[PDB]
DNA sequence: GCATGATCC
DNA sequence: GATCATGCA
């Protein structure tokens, strides 16, 4: 049966209340600078639909939208702050963000509507998204009547849910999580997006004049060196030229076909110089393609400026990915494409970009959580943990240690900070899972809390099904106890990770809310950008680096406070590239 | 979808 | 182990 509700003309007092559900629909999935194609209220004197052209233009609405006393519960009020942002209009007073709410109950669960948070109640008097505006060329906003049920509907499910929500919330102790941390953090999310990033497209379009000649040349070599033309991006035919014509050895294959991964030309290179030249192709075809083309497909040609999109309900670890443009993943390791850097710049003349990244803060978390006497000691003497690692595992002084000896030991920290299996460690340095296994087992002897914390925290995931970080985000592990050896390994490594990657993130988005509140404070100009990894990206007028300087770093070694002492790097510079 | 590679090192 | 975007099929 339909659901009652006044379809408005126009807006009334009674709309007003000071709390309801509210829906301000943005079909786009980038709601930048998207249409509002609808408005949904909920409240204590019954269900509003209003058309966006009208409630938007409305005093009333406008400044009851802006009054932080009134009360709101949402979905996913990030994008409707964002899209109402582009339109001049500030939104204040959300209480309660369902869709963070369902994030925090299990971030399994994948909810990215309210039909699916509903369901985790028993609630379905309301539809997915997907079932009303369809996907794909098919996506599109139905009629009124369609359309103003649905939001009806949503708002609806909203207004009943909140309270179940928050009672397991708070039943998990997860209460201060969404509303101290995760909600506060939404809109300052919505104010980096907004703001955006200056791009520097002439630079990056000059580039790409460079690459292009280069891929043109590496092209023609790879044609000549096989003899013949073929598609070196077709891994299928690539194969063919490799293993085929060329008859160098297949060490590595795919569920498809031929493996061609870097990790597999490296070691055919020897055999034949069209590997290197495919080697070199990748790259460069990788830098034109994804970054120079893609970063340039995306930047808004009026402002220059590139709007990410920071999904904040994603990742089971805790940590924020970013769309649309990805700018977590901007090269930065090899020089040639980390020069991609140089293009991003400050939004206005005489401002710097400033960067500052936390230093091991996931090995520092797990000597705080594991307590383990060695790993703390090393950080209280705020030592090199790589060296210190390779010293302890391998039982020589700090001269001893090798360059290659750091590297491993360095690669054995690596494991243990994004949980990879033996097997993994193995790949990784090119050797056995046996001798893999065999640095594992050193590594243990020297830090024996964190084998204890390894064994414990993988039983604690078996007796309760899950396991938790510092600030109280959880993971629930189903297969902790499946019989299938490779499923269940991987639930004791996300179990013992979880709470060192979850923590880390924790502390991030703490440090970015006392940051915010701390430039406030300060009446600086300076502002957030970025948020990639364990670092935090501002922008702010040259004049005020030196009180950044000692600022940024100060809030984010107090975000919390461990038993052993965080640390903060930083730079700054006139591009990106610079801040380094 | 599958395979690849960029960032986490 | 994580994320997201690319070209090819
Ligand atoms: O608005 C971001 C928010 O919405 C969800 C669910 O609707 O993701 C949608 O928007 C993203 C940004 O464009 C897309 O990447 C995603 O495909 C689309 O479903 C949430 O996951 C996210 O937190
Ligand atoms: O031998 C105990 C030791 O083995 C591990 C392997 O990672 O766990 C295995 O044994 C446990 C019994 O104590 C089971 O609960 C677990 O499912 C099985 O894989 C370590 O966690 C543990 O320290």
């Known amino acids: 049966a339909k659901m009652a509700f006044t379809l408005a003309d126009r807006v009334t007092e009674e709309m007003l209340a000071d709390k309801a559900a509210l829906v301000v629909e943005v079909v786009e999935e980038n709601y930048h600078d998207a249409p509002i194609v609808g408005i949904a209220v909920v409240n204590e004197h019954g269900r509003f639909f209003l058309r966006p052209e009208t409630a938007l233009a409305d005093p009333q609405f406008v400044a009851w939208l802006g009054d932080e006393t009134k009360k709101k519960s949402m979905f996913d009020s990030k994008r409707a702050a964002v899209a109402l942002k582009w339109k001049g209009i500030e939104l204040c007073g959300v209480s309660f963000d369902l869709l963070l709410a369902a994030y925090l109950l299990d971030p399994a669960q994948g909810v990215d509507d309210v039909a699916a948070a509903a369901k985790m109640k028993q609630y379905e008097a309301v539809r997915p998204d997907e079932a009303v505006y369809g996907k794909g060329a098919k996506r599109a906003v139905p009629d009124e009547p369609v359309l103003a049920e649905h939001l009806v509907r949503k708002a609806a499910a909203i207004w009943e849910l909140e309270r179940p929500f928050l009672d397991e919330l708070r039943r998990n102790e997860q209460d201060r999580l969404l509303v101290e941390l995760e909600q506060p953090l939404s809109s300052i999310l919505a104010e980096m997006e907004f703001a955006g990033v200056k791009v520097d497209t002439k630079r990056l379009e000059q580039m790409g004049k460079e690459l292009a000649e280069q891929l043109g040349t590496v092209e023609q070599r790879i044609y000549e060196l096989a003899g013949q033309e073929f598609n070196i991006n077709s891994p299928k035919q690539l194969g063919v030229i490799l293993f085929e014509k060329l008859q160098l050895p297949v060490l590595k294959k795919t569920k ?50 590139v709007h990410t999109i920071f999904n904040q309900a994603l990742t089971q670890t805790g940590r924020l990915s970013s769309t649309e443009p990805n700018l977590q993943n901007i090269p930065i390791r090899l020089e040639e494409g980390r020069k991609i850097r140089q293009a991003f710049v400050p939004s206005e003349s005489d401002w710097l970009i400033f960067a500052a990244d936390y230093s091991q803060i996931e090995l520092r978390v797990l000597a705080h959580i594991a307590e383990d006497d060695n790993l703390m000691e090393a950080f209280r003497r705020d030592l090199d943990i790589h060296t210190k690692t390779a010293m302890d595992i391998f039982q020589v002084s700090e001269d001893e240690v090798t360059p290659n000896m750091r590297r491993q030991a360095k690669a054995v920290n690596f494991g243990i900070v994004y949980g990879i299996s033996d097997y993994g460690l193995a790949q990784n340095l090119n050797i056995s899972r046996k001798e893999a296994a065999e640095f594992i087992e050193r590594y243990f002897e020297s830090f024996p809390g964190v084998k204890r914390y390894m064994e414990n925290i993988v039983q604690e995931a078996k007796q309760k099904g899950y396991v938790t970080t510092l600030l109280h985000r959880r993971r629930y592990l189903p297969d902790i106890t499946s019989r299938n050896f490779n499923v269940r390994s991987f639930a004791e490594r996300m179990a013992m990770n979880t709470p060192i990657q979850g923590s880390a993130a924790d502390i991030i988005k703490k440090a970015m809310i006392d940051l915010n509140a701390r430039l406030k404070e300060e009446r600086l100009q300076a502002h957030l950008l970025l948020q990639v990894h364990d670092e935090l990206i501002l922008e702010a007028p040259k004049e005020e680096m030196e009180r950044l300087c000692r600022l940024v770093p100060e809030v984010m070694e107090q975000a919390v406070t461990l038993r052993v002492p965080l640390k903060v790097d930083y730079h700054y510079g006139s591009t990106w590239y610079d801040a380094k």
């Open 256 to 305: 498809t076909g031929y493996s061609t991964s870097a990790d597999v030309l490296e070691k055919l290179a020897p055999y034949h110089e069209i590997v290197e030249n495919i080697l070199h192709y990748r790259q460069l075809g990788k830098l034109q393609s994804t970054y120079i083309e893609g970063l340039l497909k995306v930047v808004r040609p009026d402002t220059k400026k």
